[PDB]
Structures are given as C-alpha cells and as structure tokens.
A paper describes a structure:
The equatorial domain connects the subunits in the heptameric ring and facilitates interactions between the two rings of tetradecamers.
Importantly, the heptameric naïve EcHsp60ΔC showed similar ATPase activity to the WT naïve EcHsp607, indicating that the C-terminal truncation did not significantly affect the protein structure. The crystal structure of naïve EcHsp607 showed a typical heptameric, single-ring conformation in an asymmetric unit. The β1/β16 strands form a strong interaction with the β2/β3 strands of the neighboring protomer and stabilize the heptameric complex. The thermal parameter distribution of the naïve EcHsp607 coordinate showed relatively low b-factor values in the equatorial domain compared with the apical and intermediate domains, suggesting that the equatorial domain is stabilized upon forming the heptameric conformation. The α4 helix of naïve EcHsp607 was found to be folded into the core region of the equatorial domain with α1, α5, α16, and α20, whereas in naïve EcHsp602, the α4 helix extended out from the equatorial domain and interacts with the neighboring subunit. In naïve EcHsp607, the ATP-binding motif, DGTTT, is located in the N-terminus of α4 helix and forms a pocket with G414 and D494.
Residue numbers in the entry:
A (entry chain B): 26 to 326, 332 to 550
B (entry chain A): 26 to 326, 331 to 550
C (entry chain C): 26 to 325, 332 to 498, 502 to 550
Amino acid sequence: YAKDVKFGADARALMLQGVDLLADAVAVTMGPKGRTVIIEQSWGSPKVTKDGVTVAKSIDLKDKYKNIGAKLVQDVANNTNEEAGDGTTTATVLARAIAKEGFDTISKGANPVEIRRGVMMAVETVIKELKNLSKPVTTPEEIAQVATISANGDVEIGNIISNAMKKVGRKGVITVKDGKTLHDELEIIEGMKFDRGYISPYFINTAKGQKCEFQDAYLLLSEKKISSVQSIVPALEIANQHRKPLVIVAEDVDGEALSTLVLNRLKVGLQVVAVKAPGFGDNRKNQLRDMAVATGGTVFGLALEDIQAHDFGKIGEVQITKDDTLLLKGGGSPAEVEKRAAEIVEQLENTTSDYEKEKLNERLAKLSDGVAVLKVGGTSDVEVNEKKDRVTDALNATRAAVEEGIVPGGGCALLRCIPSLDAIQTANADQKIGVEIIRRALRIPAMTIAKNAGVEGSLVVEKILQGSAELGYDAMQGEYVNMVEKGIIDPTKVVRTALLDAAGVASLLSTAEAVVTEIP
Amino acid sequence: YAKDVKFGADARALMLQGVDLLADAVAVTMGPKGRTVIIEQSWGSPKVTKDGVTVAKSIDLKDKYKNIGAKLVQDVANNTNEEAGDGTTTATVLARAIAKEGFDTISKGANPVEIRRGVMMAVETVIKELKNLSKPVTTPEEIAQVATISANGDVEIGNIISNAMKKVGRKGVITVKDGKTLHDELEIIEGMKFDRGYISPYFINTAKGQKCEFQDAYLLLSEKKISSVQSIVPALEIANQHRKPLVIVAEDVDGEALSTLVLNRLKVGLQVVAVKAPGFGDNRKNQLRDMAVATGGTVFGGLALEDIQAHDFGKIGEVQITKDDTLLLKGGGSPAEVEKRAAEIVEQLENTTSDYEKEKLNERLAKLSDGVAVLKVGGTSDVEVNEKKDRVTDALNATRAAVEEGIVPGGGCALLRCIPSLDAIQTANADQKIGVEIIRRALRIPAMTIAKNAGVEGSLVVEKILQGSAELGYDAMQGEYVNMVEKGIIDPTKVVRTALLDAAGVASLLSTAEAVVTEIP
Amino acid sequence: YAKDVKFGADARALMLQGVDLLADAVAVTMGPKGRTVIIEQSWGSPKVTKDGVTVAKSIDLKDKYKNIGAKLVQDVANNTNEEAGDGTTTATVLARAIAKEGFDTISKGANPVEIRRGVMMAVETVIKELKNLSKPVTTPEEIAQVATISANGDVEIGNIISNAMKKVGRKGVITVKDGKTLHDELEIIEGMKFDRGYISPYFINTAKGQKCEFQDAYLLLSEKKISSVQSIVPALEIANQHRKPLVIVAEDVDGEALSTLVLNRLKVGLQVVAVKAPGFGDNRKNQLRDMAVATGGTVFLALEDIQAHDFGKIGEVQITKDDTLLLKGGGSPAEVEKRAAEIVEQLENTTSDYEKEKLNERLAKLSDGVAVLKVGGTSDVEVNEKKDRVTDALNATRAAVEEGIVPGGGCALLRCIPSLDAIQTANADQKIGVEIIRRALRIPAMTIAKNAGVEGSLVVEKILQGSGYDAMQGEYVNMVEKGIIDPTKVVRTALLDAAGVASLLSTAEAVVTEIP
C-alpha cells in the first residue's frame, strides 16, 4: 500500500518520456507509406501491422510515471478513435508535440496557466478555420464518391454504402454483417438502436468489437431495478429450458442478481446479457413500453417473478457493444407497432414543449424507421470477413464525412490553418508562446507522413505553405497535386476531434503538479 | 515485535519530512486556480483530481517515521473536514508551516514549551479577531444568497437549500439524495437522527463511502447488551424469511452475536447492520422507547429475546448509517401512537427541575416531532444527477457552517486581515515572540499558496492586500483585487477557525514528541 | 505484461542477427554435398540430419528480437515448403542475403521505399526470365523422366508416378501409403479430396506429421453450424456404441460443442475429427449433398434424431491442416452416377465459364476417383523410408508439371543475372536495390559450391563467362540434360517469398517485445 510521489517538472519529464516512447512507436505507421511495427504475441508468430490503434494498445511501460503518461494519451487517442473512426495516430503525434513544447517552455520559467490559455486560443482559431475549410458532403453522388475513396477505388462498396444511406438517411442506422452470398447486398428490416451497452462484459462474440452477439433471444423488460436473485431465477430457468438467450433490459441490474448472472455466464455458459434501460426519468418507462410493444413482450415492476414465457419479447438478433445496443428483429405485431405510433402522433399535436417534442419524435423514429443491414459478399469466408472490416471502416469514414464535411488529407488540412494563427489578440508573452507551440504542432502530421514516405518533411511543408492553394503532397505517387480534386481527403470530424483531444490531454499533463504512484 | 526508537529532533525531522511530502502534494490543489494531482489507481486508468481530501487520503509513505507524521496530520485534517465541511488543504498547509518553523526554531535551542505557549496565545488572538470580523448569517434572504454563492451561481440550488433550511430550521435535519425527476424538489417527511454509527463495517454502498443504506427494513431495539447468538438467531431468520433487512439497535452488540452478524453478512450476504443505542444512562432507555414508538416496534429488556413474532419489529422505510451518525427516514409507527407519547415528555417537563433533564426531554420531543427535509436533485442524465447531488451536498454543508458561525472573506484573506491583530501581545520572554512570529508567517501561507497556484507571485499580492484597503483582496480567478465580500468570494468562519485551531494543535503535538517508537520491518 | 520497444536500425540489427544464425544453420545443408547438422534431442541419441527444413524448425533464440526475426523467416520458408515441396534452404539463404544488403544500405542513408521499389522490379524481371527459361513438362515421357530423376535414378518409382499421373491426369488426386506387398503397386479407387482441414488439433497420428488417420469411420454432414452439445451427444453415443470413429463435416463447429469434442478425445479418446464444410455459398450446399450421396449418408431432419442410416461411411480418412482426404465411400454407385447425370445436365444447359468450372470440379470429385501408391519392400522400416522418398518425388514431379523445370544447383538464378542489366531505374536507390538482388542471385550456387568443397567465387565466374558445376561429379556440365534440375515453381516461390520477407523486415521501424 506504499506510495511514491513526484512533483512538477520531475514527474512531467517522466510522463513525457512515456508519451515520447508511445508516439515514437505510433508515428511510424502514419501516412500511405507508413512503416511496419512488429509486435510479439504470447503464442504463435509475431504480429506485423501498420495500424496505429493496435500499436498504441500494445504499449505498456515498466516505470510507473512514464506508463501513467502513456496510458493517459492512449485513453484520449482511443476515445478519439471511437467517435470518428480514425485519428488515433494524428491525436497521438499532436499530443506528443504539444506536450513536449509546453513542458520545455514551462520548465524554463513560463506560466503554465497563461500557456494553456493561448494554446486553447490557437486551437479554437484552427478549429474555426478548419470548419471554414471543410467541403460538405450532402448529395448522394458526393456520398458515393467519398465512400469509394474510403474503399480505395471499390465502386461496388461505395455504391452500396450510398444506397443504404439513401434508403435510411444520414441519421439512419447502418450495420455490416457477414454475407453468405457471392454478391454483396443490403436490405432494410425492422430494428431498434439505443445508446446503452452491457453493464459488465458478457462477450459471447469474444472477438473483435468486444460485444455480445445472440440470435433468436428473449427480451425481459423491467422498470424496477433487478437486484434480488429470487426475482430473476425463474426468468433464467425459463430461458435455459428453451435454450434461448435472455436479454435483460432493466433500470439497473446489480447486487446478488448481477453476481449470479456473472457466475452463470462463466461456469455453465449461460447466454444472458444485462443492459441498462435507455433514457432517464419518465422517458425511461415510455421507451421500455415502446420496446416491449416492438418485441411483443411486457414490462415488469405482474410481480416480476411470475413470468410465464409469454411475458418475454422476441429478438431475432441482438448486438450489444460497450455503449450501445442493437435489437434487430422484433417479435411484435406490425398492427401493434403501428397503433403505438398513433399514440405518439396524438401526443405530438397536443404537447408543445421543445424538449418533449424531440424525445417523442425520437421514439417515433425508433418505432417506425428500421435498420439497414448490408451483407458483404465474396468467394471465401475469410475474404468476406476482411471485406466486412474494410466496409465498416469506409462506412464510419463516410458517416464522419457526412457529419462534418471533408478536408484535404495528408495532414495538409492542419497545414493550411497555420496562416490563421498570425492574427490572434494575445495578451502577454506566454500566450504568444502557447500559440507558437500550436503553430509548431500543426506541421507535425504532414512532416511525419513525409518522413515515412522517405522525403524530407521540412522542404515539403515549406513548398506547400509557400505554394499554390490546395496543393498538397501525395506520398504514394510522390508529386504535388490537388488533394481534394484527386481524392486525397480526410473527414473534418476526424482531424477536429484528434486536434481537440490532443490539446486537451497535453493541457491535462501541463496542469499536473504531482503524481502519486505505488511502490513496486 | 522488535522496536526502533528515535529521540527529539532526529525523529521530528523525519516526521516533518513526511508532513512536508503530504502538504506539498495537497497544496497544489489549493484555490480556485489549483493544479492537478494524478493518483495511480491499482486497477484501471489513473485518477486525475484537484481535491485535496482525496489527495491526502491517498498518500502513504514507505519510511515509518515520516508515515507516522503524515498519518497524524491526515487524521487532524480529516476530523477538521468532517465537522465543518472544508478546510482540509488549509489545515494541512498551516500545519506544515507551523511545524516547519517551530522545529527550526526549537532545534536551534529554543524552549518548545514557551514556543507553544505563545503560538496558542496568538492563535487565540487571531480567533478572537476572526469572530469579530465574521459577518453573521441569520435572515432567510442572507441564507439564500450564501447558498447561491456556494452553488457557483445556480439560483435554484440556493433557493431549494434556503427553502429546506426555512422549513426545518437551522438546527434541523437535511439530507440530499438522488432524484428520478428532471426537476429538483424538496419535501418534508418523518425522520430521526442520532450521532451513533455502525459497530463494524456493513457497507452495502462502498461507492457512497462508509455508508450502510437500504430500504424497507425491520428494526429490533434491545435495552440489554446483545452478545448471545442463541437470542439473535430467531430475529435473523424472521427477517430473512420476509426478505427484509434487519437493523439492530441495542446498548451494545458484541461478542459471538457480532461475530456471527459480520461473518454471515460477508459470506452469505445477510442484510443486517448493528448500531449502538444512542444516549447514556437513563436517557438511553427513554430514547430507545421513543425510537420504538416512532417505528412501531417494541423494546426488549416476558419481553425477552428469541420470542419475536415480527410484530415486535419496527418498520423503517429508509435507513442511512455512516461512521458517525444514523438516519432512520420513514417510521412505520402510528401517528396517534407518537402524538400521545410526546404528552408523556411534556408532562415530565413540568416535574423536572435539573435544568439538564429538561434539555434532554426537549431534544427527545424535537426528535419525535421535527422530521427531516429530503431534497432530490433533478437533471437530464443520471450521472449528471449524481454529480449535482455531490455539488448540492457540498453547498449545503457550506451553508450550514455559514449559518452556524457566519462568513469571512475567502481566499485565505481572513487570516491575512488578522495579521495586524497580534502586533499587541504581552509577550513574557523571547520564545513567546518567536511563536507569535511563527503563527504570523503561517497566516500568509494559504493566500500565498492560492496566488502561486493561480500563477502570480504571492509575495507581492499579500503585501498589496495588506498595504491597501480593508475590503480589497484577490480574485485569483479573474486576477483582480476586488471587494470579495460583495463580489461573492467568501468562506465560512467555522471552516477557517477550525482549520487554524486544528493545524496549531497538530503542530504542537508533533513538536511535543521527544521519542518515536516504530517496529523493525 | 510490460513491454520493451526498439526502433529502426537498432531493432533491425537484432532481427538480422537472428536470421543470420538461422540461415547459417540452414545453409550448411544446401546442395548435393550438403554438410551435417546435429540437433540435441530431449531423450535418446542426438538427431543427425542434412535436411534444411528440420534444422530450421529446430531453431529458437533466447533474446526476443533475434528470435522474432528468425521466426518470421522460418514461417515464410515453411509456407514456401508447403506449396512447392522444396526451396526452404533456398528461400532462407536468399532472404538472409537480401536482408543483410538492404539493412547495410538503409542504415547508411538510403530510402527503404525506393529500395523495395526496384528490388521488386528486379525480382519481377528475374521471374519473367525464369519463366522464359523453364522447359515445360507435359508429355508422359517427360513426366516419367522427371519422376525418375527426382527418385534418384529409380526407374520403378518414376514409372509408377508417371502411370498414376496418366491414369488420373495432372490435376488428379495422388496419395502415397505403406504397402504390404513385396512389389509396389497402384490402383484407382473411388475417392474424394477437398481443401479443408481440422478445426482443432485432433491427431491420432502424433508422429509422421500432424494427421488424423483412422479407418472405417462414420460421417455426418450438417449445413447448419454445430455449437450445442445437446445436438451432438446422440451422434457421439451412436459412434461410441459401435466403436467407429466419427468425422463431422459442418459449416462450422465451435463453442460448447467444440470444447466437448476436444476434451473428450483428450481424456477418453473419442476418435472424433471435425472439419469445416468446403466451399462457400450455394456451392457449399451442393457439394455437401454430393459428398453425402457419395458416402451414402444424409445432410442435416435435425441433429438430435440421427440413428445410423443418416451416417455416411468412410473406409479411410486422412485430415491435415489444409486438406481432407475421404478415401473409401459408402454410397451405392447407382446413386453416384445418378448424381453425376444431374451435374452433366446442368453443365449442358449453363454457359457461364465460372459456374461450369465448379460443376466440372464437382463431377470429377464424384466420378474421377483418387489414386493410391502402395510402396513395396522387404521390411516395414524400408517401406516407410521409400514412402517418404516417393512422396518427395511425387511432389517434385507435380510441381514440375505445374511450371516446368529449370537447371538446378542454383544455376537457374545464376542465368538470370545477365538479363538484369536492362532495367529503367528512376533514381540511384532503385539501382541499389537491383544490385542487391543481383548480388543475392549468386548466393545459392555459391553456397552449394562451398558445401561441395570448392569456392563459389571462381565457380560462379566460370559458369557465367562461358557457354554449371555438377557438385557431386566435380565437373562443369550442362545441368539440364545431365539431370541436375529443379522445379521452376520451387525457385520462383522461394525467390518471391525471400524478397517479400526481406522487404517486410526492411519496412519494420519498431519492434515491440515483452519484458522477460
């Protein structure tokens, strides 16, 4: 239980060493000419990868302080990845640059608060000019073009993504699953997606995604919090006797019930997953009722322990990831669900609250609008799985592009925001120092990509900055071209979130004046 | 079992090094512009915080003597926090300053007794002039203003705090809990509060922190000391049969009964919490009877144990038991049962003449009649509700302290304004003057630390405040010398007074130690 | 848990040292005059071998980075061996040469991308010239000559291999098995072969390769995936009551069913082997039904009610990681030619080329049986040794049929050097990579000469400046007609795999290893 504490510059230097190691490992994968990282496995052949995310996840340091810094940067870059589908490497390298420059300037006597205030000013200016620079993607032709670009010249993949988006909309739900047909195809089916994940890991998938994948499962709905084991044993035995998976949607599953669910999940292989009910307040119960009528079940909170297996709903397929749950095939009657929406539209014409209208319309969309499942084809199952990974990545990229537009790739989007930093109303010298830190960091992504391509980063950056507009550097072909015209693009959401999160983590490391670790 | 013993300044140096490490960790969080402390969690991500309390709670050194010093200062600061609601960081930094300067002067040959005499003298002078400087908070409008200030400019939180305090009084019972509604609201229900905690760890909610809370529980009250398993098994099985938690209130629960209650709770999962009966002497029996009639149960003292028929149990809708107090919320007792029990107390109030029995009789009557005000915080997200509950709890404790002892200018500027007060002290010898100078240097430390964490140099800021008017301090958030009382930069007088008193006490205790005995590792 | 990472040339040097050790061990076995490697065994006398493959498989280093490099090269060379049947040593030595030269040039300031672009250009040019150099083997006389040459001047082995290939075609199925007769003989029996392996290690034949080789086995076929123990217990009970092995061909066996199956064979020896159903989509179901009618079983109405009339019969089955052989069928012939009539009727109507290929492949599986080679002899030990030799000769002959033959002794690569002089290089680094490949091309012949006793520095120059150094004879002859040949597929795949692994090692800028 012993502790060791370091203070100020001494601790920040160790954490900076950790982030230096992490970003040195990650940055070699940047750009189309990214290099290879070899990661030793516990068993089998070593892993060869150019993926920044898997490289960052594999890094773990022995010394406590540098490990702490690396873990902080890893968490920030990872939550950047989960939002936009990319930008882990960009966030990591930007964070290292900003943290290094800030620690060097602070350790020489600069005021940390007046540096963070000014680093944030430059970041805000860069974000504003980046949003000004973004080219929106709204038309189906633009969507197909972006999807094909993210699919690396696959016209079929871009066309199927564009058709799915046209058929369910930009706000619609799109998922990709393994296809058993030689040709990829999409279809619109009923469905329901809410942003609540599993309470604790019950991965039956036990594979990529860290989710749960049942098929032909039961649905147990309860407004009451389920904590008594005696009130949940009958449901578990009813589900087990029919050998169907059970999905428990309650306000909260905890205590003895959660303990028994975990024990049975790992001892007798019980296929049960507990997920918190979506929403809050009275909207929780309305969403539960809507879900129950969609699945043809009933809600408890009926004594909750007298289940007769007619109380359960039916779920054809369910996918429960960390922060959201997808219910695919409902068991409720179409006449049942169409009448439930009638109540919602009746309440729409009466209630006029802005907050109440949004929730009711979202429930209406959940009941009426379905999900779009596109299945990826191929001549072999491993080809189908690899194409599934590629199509998922392209779909996330296209969703980000529709959300926030596109900007020139190769790090040139951040490079073209440099001239906007020369007109910031800075108060004192430390604010200018922070702005200069951000300005120096803006060149890091493009320079790293150039270095990975083999050419010198400084000269390429100088030519791009002192050259014609929209003239970037295509590393794969080794020539200065128009990036957006020739398709070298990145989603604006990716770069914006990466820069914002890197600045946030760097400022968090700059605010740390003491680090407490455990004596090994 | 071997022991190592160090003497005098040699051991005091190690203990001072420990408190130096602890206070250096804590002080970086001081002030509204405080810095960040990273605490490595054993499992999961590192913990990033600016709270001095959790920073001090997480420090535990390797060497025995410095760990002893750190633990002493931690305990003093922690018991400062429990009584007032804040001042852990202030107490820690003041304690380190006083201990450092006292050890330096004493080790140079000064008399420690005649230094502590004079440190305490100037502490008394500072406290007197602080009470003189304190502005009382008595009117409901002032209470609402203070609550809104403490809630960081949220009008509804201040209004709801002021409404609750108005509805139950300044001496009344207020607790904050999670709310399921989007809108925050307060209501007054029956209740009972007494300063007795759990006998042994029974924490159902470890996340809440050393609290044992559940709903719809049975209650058995025993005048006799429950120490036999045979007499408590029937009650336990009766409570288990109905799937209801059991609360044991008795003169003392110990021995094999306590051992079985702890072991079965840890292993099987018994929903049982044992709490010592409140009061002492003949009053303990009287308020045990009062609790029984308030909850609808009966007192055991043919009314022996192992004869419970579940009609001898009191019913409690909600119970919260913490380390230092217990809260029974919803009583199952009949309203007519309790409205005629208070008649007995009133009748005894005519007979009593001790002028102290009447105080306890009135306290029992108030406990029977006065309820508790529960206010549930609203929000659009459950996590938002939890965080707002924490914020409202902190604001409510600050407002309670302010009502108790008034308010003073914040940012440690009250201690800054008490500096000229001690220039006129009848010092006997030089050592008393030395102690007075030690405390004078200490008085500037909180404001200087807040300024340093803000970025600016505190040495110039303190002198600028001292040489200027008696109303302009330092914002340190806007970096402007402002009228802090009018602008809203205030601190409760109770918090600062207790912080200074406890820091002086722990420094004196650390400077009276002439021998430290540790165990050979 | 804790990780240690090295960057750039520092890590590439450790990996190069590891591959240096591995290739130094392997290269002493190259050529007809290859030297001897003694590998210590856990029990018994040490193993004395001149085989590059077994020496390479017996290398494991203590330091993390050099072991990582050695294992990368090992895996590349091994999967080179599994495709063509030879070239492990060739691939290893070429990989070491290319990696050494490339690392030395890169560490001195060259651009790795502009080196790999140009190394691959030279490799492609060498491949084109090698395919130009190859003499195709298509006639039965040439097939017999190649088989006899591979069999070390064994006329009978060459004759039997050539006859088997003639009787089942060059695309046919040929397997080698121990013979109980004094004289080796072949026969064509009904049989089936598809590229699907065991889901989990199930080897009852622990030695002589990783094989599941039992006889007189039941066969169940399931279109749906099998993951429930409730749906597989009846099959196991039925198979165990009759003391007959069970082969499971399904879409996928995983989860509780797979765990129960793998645990049972370990503890009681259930004699159960599972294998994923071959193919994809509709072709999977069609050929699953074809297999069912070939074995007499039925496809799976559920997995609970099975009995035994729904069980295909397999006389002999051999399952490796990449392919499954079902030797003896159980279905009635009137059932199998009736199914073939439907296949030819469907082929008579369809005109798509891609769909006709799978139809004819299914028809060949149904009708064209497999060919077995029983190897004769006077002792079981000699029969097994001859079986190993004949299997090697058959693999070499089939590779030669695939892509022709080229002069052996490393001369095939040596004769592509003069054709490397005409390459349009963009910059100096591409020329440097071309030079790396050019220097590496001499390495196999040089190693063979060095192991033969003579020094290859003069041997290579004599071979080039003239009109090939048979190492065993010691005289420069024309290797092709003399008999010193290698399959063109072997050298092509070895060169390509060595270049690929060397490029992969050159593109590595960071190695992440675990703290010991």
